[PDB]
Design an enzyme around this catalytic site. Structure first.
Site, PDB file in Angstrom:
ATOM      1  N   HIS A   1     -25.727  -8.278 -10.938  1.00  0.00           N
ATOM      2  CA  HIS A   1     -27.043  -7.839 -11.020  1.00  0.00           C
ATOM      3  C   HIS A   1     -27.885  -7.698  -9.827  1.00  0.00           C
ATOM      4  CE1 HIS A   1     -26.950  -8.187 -15.762  1.00  0.00           C
ATOM      5  NE2 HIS A   1     -26.264  -7.026 -15.142  1.00  0.00           N
TER       6      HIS A   1
ATOM      7  N   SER B   1     -24.129  -1.737 -10.599  1.00  0.00           N
ATOM      8  CA  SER B   1     -22.758  -1.673 -11.133  1.00  0.00           C
ATOM      9  C   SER B   1     -22.390  -0.227 -10.554  1.00  0.00           C
ATOM     10  CB  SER B   1     -23.113  -1.310 -12.888  1.00  0.00           C
ATOM     11  OG  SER B   1     -23.218  -2.780 -13.507  1.00  0.00           O
TER      12      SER B   1
ATOM     13  N   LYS C   1     -21.832   1.201 -27.440  1.00  0.00           N
ATOM     14  CA  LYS C   1     -20.405   1.356 -27.025  1.00  0.00           C
ATOM     15  C   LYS C   1     -19.730   0.191 -26.897  1.00  0.00           C
ATOM     16  CE  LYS C   1     -18.362   4.080 -23.075  1.00  0.00           C
ATOM     17  NZ  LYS C   1     -17.703   3.169 -22.436  1.00  0.00           N
ATOM     18  N   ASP C   2     -20.129  -0.954 -26.536  1.00  0.00           N
ATOM     19  CA  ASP C   2     -19.489  -2.304 -26.412  1.00  0.00           C
ATOM     20  C   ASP C   2     -19.207  -2.781 -27.766  1.00  0.00           C
ATOM     21  OD1 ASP C   2     -19.378  -2.444 -23.490  1.00  0.00           O
ATOM     22  OD2 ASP C   2     -21.391  -3.234 -23.389  1.00  0.00           O
TER      23      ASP C   2
ATOM     24  N   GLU D   1       5.403 -18.357 -19.883  1.00  0.00           N
ATOM     25  CA  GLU D   1       5.053 -17.298 -20.717  1.00  0.00           C
ATOM     26  C   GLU D   1       4.653 -16.009 -20.083  1.00  0.00           C
ATOM     27  OE1 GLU D   1       4.942 -17.187 -24.021  1.00  0.00           O
ATOM     28  OE2 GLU D   1       4.364 -15.379 -24.486  1.00  0.00           O
TER      29      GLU D   1
HETATM   30  C1  HEM Z   1     -13.160 -14.454 -15.774  1.00  0.00           C
HETATM   31  C2  HEM Z   1     -13.364 -13.194 -16.340  1.00  0.00           C
HETATM   32  C3  HEM Z   1     -14.311 -12.220 -15.892  1.00  0.00           C
HETATM   33  C4  HEM Z   1     -15.416 -11.939 -16.607  1.00  0.00           C
HETATM   34  C5  HEM Z   1     -15.967 -12.782 -17.958  1.00  0.00           C
HETATM   35  C6  HEM Z   1     -16.222 -10.947 -15.806  1.00  0.00           C
HETATM   36  C7  HEM Z   1     -17.460 -10.496 -16.550  1.00  0.00           C
HETATM   37  C8  HEM Z   1     -17.615  -9.346 -15.887  1.00  0.00           C
HETATM   38  C9  HEM Z   1     -18.968  -8.735 -16.338  1.00  0.00           C
HETATM   39  C10 HEM Z   1     -19.797  -8.804 -17.519  1.00  0.00           C
HETATM   40  C11 HEM Z   1     -18.998  -7.562 -15.648  1.00  0.00           C
HETATM   41  C12 HEM Z   1     -19.997  -6.247 -15.767  1.00  0.00           C
HETATM   42  C13 HEM Z   1     -19.652  -5.422 -16.650  1.00  0.00           C
HETATM   43  C14 HEM Z   1     -18.239  -4.802 -16.357  1.00  0.00           C
HETATM   44  O1  HEM Z   1     -18.207  -3.868 -15.558  1.00  0.00           O
HETATM   45  O2  HEM Z   1     -17.211  -5.374 -16.717  1.00  0.00           O
HETATM   46  C15 HEM Z   1     -18.175  -7.575 -14.631  1.00  0.00           C
HETATM   47  C16 HEM Z   1     -17.929  -6.649 -13.574  1.00  0.00           C
HETATM   48  C17 HEM Z   1     -17.267  -6.707 -12.527  1.00  0.00           C
HETATM   49  N1  HEM Z   1     -16.133  -7.616 -12.401  1.00  0.00           N
HETATM   50 FE1  HEM Z   1     -15.954  -9.228 -13.545  1.00  0.00          FE
HETATM   51  N2  HEM Z   1     -15.362 -10.638 -14.954  1.00  0.00           N
HETATM   52  C18 HEM Z   1     -14.349 -11.371 -14.889  1.00  0.00           C
HETATM   53  C19 HEM Z   1     -13.300 -11.362 -13.915  1.00  0.00           C
HETATM   54  C20 HEM Z   1     -13.189 -10.487 -12.531  1.00  0.00           C
HETATM   55  C21 HEM Z   1     -12.304 -10.701 -11.821  1.00  0.00           C
HETATM   56  C22 HEM Z   1     -11.069 -11.625 -11.765  1.00  0.00           C
HETATM   57  C23 HEM Z   1     -12.880  -9.826 -10.574  1.00  0.00           C
HETATM   58  C24 HEM Z   1     -12.157  -9.728  -9.293  1.00  0.00           C
HETATM   59  C25 HEM Z   1     -12.393 -10.383  -8.513  1.00  0.00           C
HETATM   60  C26 HEM Z   1     -14.060  -9.170 -11.223  1.00  0.00           C
HETATM   61  C27 HEM Z   1     -14.812  -8.311 -10.492  1.00  0.00           C
HETATM   62  C28 HEM Z   1     -15.916  -7.594 -10.919  1.00  0.00           C
HETATM   63  C29 HEM Z   1     -16.418  -6.521 -10.665  1.00  0.00           C
HETATM   64  C30 HEM Z   1     -16.056  -5.836  -9.098  1.00  0.00           C
HETATM   65  C31 HEM Z   1     -17.410  -5.812 -11.429  1.00  0.00           C
HETATM   66  C32 HEM Z   1     -18.243  -4.484 -11.321  1.00  0.00           C
HETATM   67  C33 HEM Z   1     -17.351  -3.369 -11.608  1.00  0.00           C
HETATM   68  C34 HEM Z   1     -18.453  -2.351 -11.674  1.00  0.00           C
HETATM   69  O3  HEM Z   1     -19.720  -2.438 -11.102  1.00  0.00           O
HETATM   70  O4  HEM Z   1     -18.096  -1.356 -12.530  1.00  0.00           O
HETATM   71  N3  HEM Z   1     -14.300  -9.795 -12.638  1.00  0.00           N
HETATM   72  N4  HEM Z   1     -17.302  -8.575 -14.745  1.00  0.00           N
END
Ligand code: HEM
Ligand code: HEC
Ligand code: HEM
Ligand code: FES
Lengths: 49, 378, 49, 238, 100, 55, 73, 65, 54, 54
Positions: free
Chosen positions: B200, B204, B226-227, B270
């Protein structure tokens, strides 16, 4: 493990430095067919079959 | 004025879930944030109720979980929810990572770093939770990976004798692993809030890579419903998994009391660790294999620092897209080779697949990027 | 030139009640509204179940 | 000899996703276990209170629980005498110690039969083929301390095939072949592996009806709320 | 040279022509790209953001344009490139002046 | 049918919530009877109610 | 990255937007969704599929190599 | 007592592949009775015969059972 | 909430689960506590509003 | 270990067998006690100087 003297010849006919671990067969135990081992694989801790 | 814009908690709610200018271009591949969050809170609930009926001791764990699945009401489905929800969480986590690599959103640097640390924490939580049921598979895999941590010269021996509480996996190791699996998802949720904070900060990402600041639709009520759609899809898939085929994922040997002498021959972690494990057993070096795994996660760190393209995504770079799909097939190849016994043609193709993994992600990405670069009059 | 700006029609899109310029919009609203809100109500009942 | 024989999937009455278990066959199989196989195999995680409303009755559960006496606690002296037990009884161990069973055999401990269907590669059909496929070694016997069985990793077992033409010739008609007792013990081991089978199928039916209900509705509402941006159009004014 | 035909095959298989886009659209943004976009006339800037918003709509709904409105390899009015050249040369000017 | 339904049960929120809770209990009852009838119907025979009906 | 009001500066644009109750729930689903998904399928055949047929060919090759090694002995 | 499973196994083992596996086991017996003093002693043809036979019985088991 | 007919092992496990899970809830609500205080601003011993001695 | 057969002996194992488990047990108990001390002092302050208007 109790073994055979012929199994000692199968074990020790191959030379000492052929293995990656240099260890002579008579070094391993004094009573040679009665081989005494800490039976766990020293790579990552397994019991070999 | 407006109650949402005055109360300080409601200001946080407004900036989080109402007045978030979102890209209007994102399909179902962006629902994964809500999917992972609802998976996380359901894992919290299932593990909490399990902890209300679990006994952390080597003698009593197997019998107590048996008492749960046979005697405590609905404890069988709550245990199945916890394990298969971990598997569904892993599916959503891999596809979240795949979106973040495919659509070029990995240019967000510190957000990617926070995600890497989250990946560490989820791996550790997963492994120690898998240790907890006191199975034969869990016992031997814990012994193997503890010796993998003892691979470190002069520091690893003291560290492994420090995490033992004995000579091997005894009651001290069992209770310590219970404590760490029992505490870690709160820290995972905190770093998830940090992840959300840096996103934020940035904002995004859309499929194009062009910033959609001229076409921002709000986060509510569009993305909320949608979610909800994606979440109830996850509900139906997960619950049909736990109520129709519970045994498509769980190992048979997982239902056995721990024998400290056996080492059954199809010993494996696993499936979400087998690609971590196929790199190990296809390299004849203990420290070399664990360093290869740590360097695979460090390659996942590196890949934001090698984006030598001039677009953002591979959406309009089809060569790098085809290399990405070859990498997808290579990941599933490494997972299946992790799911095989140690065999000589399997050894050959596993070594070739691991070196192919390294050569595609390390070497072939700037090569494909620079062919795409110089091809376009640049 | 601001009066030179005309609405493109959505004849491919509108409901079968909305395929005529003759019809009063105050006389066909409750069919559309009751259908959609009945769908949302049955959704709410399933969620509460 | 490193070539296992994988069991085929068999046409059971619990085959399909809507399929169920025969509780009368569970009754027959528990009579088989209690009257034959409990003397060599432990099933300690099954109690008589698991046998109340599954197939048996209430008073006959007291009859079965008084058929097996185990122990009472201290009678102010710790005498540890023999007690019938009414409903809280578990199933007794044939051996107090593992090495008691090891010295009663060539080692080779008989496992607990709580989880054996869900505990080996191949489920109840592995159990059926295990109890069924006994023949003779053509050329390969190893030390004559074990027996011959092809359906085994290692191809040799210390367990005698306990079937041999009506070991029980039990209560109802049901001629005690290999096949009848094998079907009954496979049904009973499936129920011992899962105490909650038909309840799971009932919830699965409920859930399939509810997901057939929700998926038109929630997709209709998502299409309805996203319907505005699906309808918008653009125009250029300089 | 046949490399022009390879570029033609690539520009066919890209898809932003099918989305009706130019080469000056999908540049990844650093701050130099931001400066280069800021160094543009008003007409081309407004036409560029009009193209971007039409592309975002036709990328959301995925109903991509007919064949006739698709831009071609010849008529690609690329214009950001000399501005990008001047911005990167000023940046190299500053880097060379600091490292001197 | 539709106009009557919208003009009655879709203009006050609390009456809407109350009537969907009442209809939710009635639908829960009807779904109990339907689902139990179907699941007992496609697995007749080997069910405990008839074996208890023996005795 | 911030809220609305300060993001972009765009003139010359008029957006028409239709009421949700104005149009149908499913405007021409079958006459459009099937050719659109055929177009999206043809747009990814030679990019997505040739890794997986390589996966299946290496699968069958290594499998039959294992079988051939374990059926002569 | 007439056991039907032996009857089903004997009536199904005259499948063509089962007959060919029967003669494969018999030619293995020809080799081992020919070449004695060995430890390659008719495992594969035996498990292949029981493989094909128990697959055909697995196709046609629960009619009498 | 007995975990039985009286206090038994289930009571002990339920109390262990809540004695673990409540302090982090306490920590998050303490963050909300301090957040509202930083919204308002702290208070002197005199009770006089103290914007002029920051 | 939260098991009613082995809880008291497990606490004794902490206090005697485990290195410094006695100081950690005493630290947890007396730190809870001083937590209540600081708690009631904080509540008494918030009522005494009159910060309860927030
Ligand atoms: C631990 C589990 C994770 C959770 C709960 C999480 C949670 C979220 C959430 C809530 C968002 C915003 C909504 C979405 O586009 O999904 C997000 C976006 C994002 N996450 Fe994660 N995330 C996780 C793991 C990761 C990992 C491992 C990466 C890679 C390093 C990552 C990279 C990103 C990126 C680059 C975005 C932005 C994507 C976009 O702008 O469309 N996330 N994440
Ligand atoms: C005493 C003799 C019996 C009797 C009456 C039965 N079993 Fe069997 N069994 C026995 C031994 C000593 C062993 C150990 C050898 C080994 O495990 O290989 C077994 C083994 C089994 C197994 C294990 C096979 C496996 O896990 O692959 C099973 C599932 C088993 N026995 C079942 C079983 C049943 C269902 C019986 C009633 C018909 C039965 N056994 C009788 C000793 C004995
Ligand atoms: C803080 C919350 C959590 C608690 C209290 C918790 C508690 C437990 C307990 C007690 C077990 C052992 C009982 C069992 O195996 O069924 C367990 C197992 C497990 N947990 Fe968790 N857990 C939590 C969160 C998670 C999360 C977030 C994941 C990952 C998604 C996870 C993955 C697992 C896995 C894979 C197992 C092994 C399942 C099995 O083998 O049956 N847990 N957990
Ligand atoms: S080979 Fe890795 S542990 Fe034995």
């Amino acid at each position: 493990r109790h073994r055979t003297k012929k199994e000692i010849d199968q074990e020790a006919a191959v030379e000492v430095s052929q293995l990656r671990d240099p260890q002579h067969d008579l070094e391993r135990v004094k009573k040679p067919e009665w081989v005494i081992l800490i039976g766990v694989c020293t790579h990552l801790g397994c019991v070999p079959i | 004025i407006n109650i949402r814009k005055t109360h300080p908690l409601m200001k946080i709610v407004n900036n989080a879930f109402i007045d978030l200018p979102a890209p209007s271009n994102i399909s179902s591949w962006w629902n994964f944030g809500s999917l992972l969050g609802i998976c996380l809170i359901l894992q919290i609930l299932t593990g909490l109720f399990l902890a209300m009926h679990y006994t952390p001791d080597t003698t009593t764990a197997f019998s107590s979980v048996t008492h749960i699945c046979r005697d405590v009401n609905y404890g069988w489905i709550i245990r199945y929810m916890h394990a298969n929800g971990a598997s569904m969480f892993f599916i959503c986590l891999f596809m979240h990572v795949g979106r973040g690599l495919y659509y070029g959103s990995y240019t967000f640097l510190e957000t990617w770093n926070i995600g890497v640390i989250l990946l560490f924490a989820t791996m550790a939580t997963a492994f120690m939770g898998y240790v907890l049921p006191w199975g034969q598979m869990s016992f031997w895999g814990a012994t193997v990976i503890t010796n993998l941590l003892s691979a470190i010269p002069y520091i690893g021996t003291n560290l492994v004798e420090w995490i033992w509480g004995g000579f091997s996996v005894d009651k001290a190791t069992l209770t310590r692993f219970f404590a760490f699996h029992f505490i870690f998802p709160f820290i995972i949720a905190a770093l998830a809030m940090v992840h959300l904070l840096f996103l934020h900060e940035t904002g995004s990402n859309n499929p194009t890579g062009i910033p959609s600041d001229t076409d921002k639709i709000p986060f509510h009520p569009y993305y909320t419903i949608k979610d909800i759609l994606g979440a109830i899809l996850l509900i139906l898939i997960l619950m049909l998994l736990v109520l129709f085929t519970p045994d498509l994922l769980g190992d048979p040997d997982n239902y056995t009391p721990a024998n400290p002498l056996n080492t059954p021959p199809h010993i494996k972690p696993e499936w979400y660790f087998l690609f971590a494990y196929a790199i190990l057993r296809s390299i004849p070096n203990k420290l070399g294999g664990v360093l290869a795994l740590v360097l695979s996660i460090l390659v996942l760190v590196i890949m934001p620092l090698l984006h030598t393209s001039k677009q953002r995504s591979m959406m309009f770079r089809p060569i790098s897209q085809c290399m990405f799909w070859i990498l997808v097939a290579d990941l599933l190849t490494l997972t299946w080779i992790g799911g095989q016994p140690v065999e000589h043609p399997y050894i050959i193709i596993g070594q070739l697949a691991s070196i192919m993994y390294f050569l595609i992600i390390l070497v072939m990405m700037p090569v494909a990027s620079i062919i795409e670069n110089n091809l376009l009059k640049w | 030139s601001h009066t030179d700006i005309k609405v493109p029609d959505f004849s491919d899109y509108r409901r079968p009640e909305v395929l005529d310029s003759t019809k009063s919009s105050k006389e066909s609203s409750e069919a559309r509204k009751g259908f959609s809100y009945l769908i949302t109500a049955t959704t709410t009942v399933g969620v509460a179940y | 000899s490193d070539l296992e024989l994988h069991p085929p999937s068999y046409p059971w009455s619990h085959r399909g996703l809507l399929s169920s278990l025969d509780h009368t066959s569970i009754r027959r199989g528990f009579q088989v276990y209690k009257q034959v196989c409990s003397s060599c195999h432990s099933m300690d995680y099954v109690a008589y209170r698991h046998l109340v409303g599954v197939c048996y009755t209430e008073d006959e559960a007291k009859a079965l629980a008084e058929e097996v006496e185990v122990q009472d606690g201290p009678n102010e002296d710790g005498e540890m005498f023999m007690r019938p037990g009414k409903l809280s009884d578990y199933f007794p161990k044939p051996y107090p110690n593992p090495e008691a069973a090891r010295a009663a055999n060539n080692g080779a401990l008989p496992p607990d039969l709580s989880y054996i269907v869900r505990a080996r590669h191949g489920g109840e059909d592995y159990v059926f083929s295990l109890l069924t496929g006994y023949c003779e070694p053509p050329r390969v016997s190893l030390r004559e301390g074990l027996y011959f069985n092809p359906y085994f990793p290692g191809q040799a077992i210390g367990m005698a095939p306990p079937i041999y033409n009506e070991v029980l010739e039990f209560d109802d008609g049901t001629p005690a072949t290999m096949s009848q007792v094998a079907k009954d013990v496979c049904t009973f081991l499936r129920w011992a592996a899962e105490p909650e089978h038909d309840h799971r199928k009932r919830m699965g039916l409920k859930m399939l009806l509810m997901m057939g209900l929700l998926l038109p509705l929630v997709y209709a509402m998502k299409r309805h709320k996203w319907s505005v941006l699906k309808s918008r159009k653009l125009a250029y004014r300089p | 040279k046949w490399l022009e035909g390879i570029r033609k095959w690539y520009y066919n298989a890209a898809g932003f022509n099918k989305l009706g886009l130019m080469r000056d659209d999908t540049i990844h943004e650093n701050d130099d790209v931001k400066e280069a976009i800021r160094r543009l006339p008003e007409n081309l800037y407004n036409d560029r953001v009009f193209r971007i918003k039409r592309a975002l709509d036709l990328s959301m709904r995925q109903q991509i344009l007919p064949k006739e409105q698709w831009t071609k390899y010849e008529e690609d009015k690329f214009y950001l490139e000399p501005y990008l050249k001047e911005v990167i040369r000023e940046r190299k000017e500053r880097e060379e002046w600091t490292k001197k | 049918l539709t106009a009557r339904l919208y003009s009655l049960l879709f203009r006050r929120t609390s009456t809407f919530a109350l009537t969907i809770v009442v209809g939710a209990l009635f639908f829960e009852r009807a779904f109990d009877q339907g689902a139990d009838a179907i699941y007992e119907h496609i697995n007749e025979g080997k069910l405990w109610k008839h074996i208890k009906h023996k005795y | 990255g911030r809220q609305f009001g300060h993001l972009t500066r765009v003139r010359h644009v008029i957006t028409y937007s239709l009421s949700p109750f104005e149009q149908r729930a499913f405007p021409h689903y079958f006459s459009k969704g099937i050719p659109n998904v055929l177009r999206r399928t043809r747009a990814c055949i030679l990019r997505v599929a040739p890794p997986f047929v390589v996966f299946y060919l290496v699968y069958t090759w290594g499998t039959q190599e294992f079988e051939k090694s374990k059926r002569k002995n | 007592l007439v056991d039907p499973l032996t009857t089903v196994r004997e009536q199904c083992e005259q499948l063509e592949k089962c007959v060919k596996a029967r003669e494969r086991l018999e030619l293995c017996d020809e080799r081992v009775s020919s070449r004695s003093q060995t430890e390659e002693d008719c495992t594969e043809e035996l498990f292949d015969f029981l493989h094909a036979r128990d697959h055909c019985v697995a196709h046609k088991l629960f009619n009498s059972l």
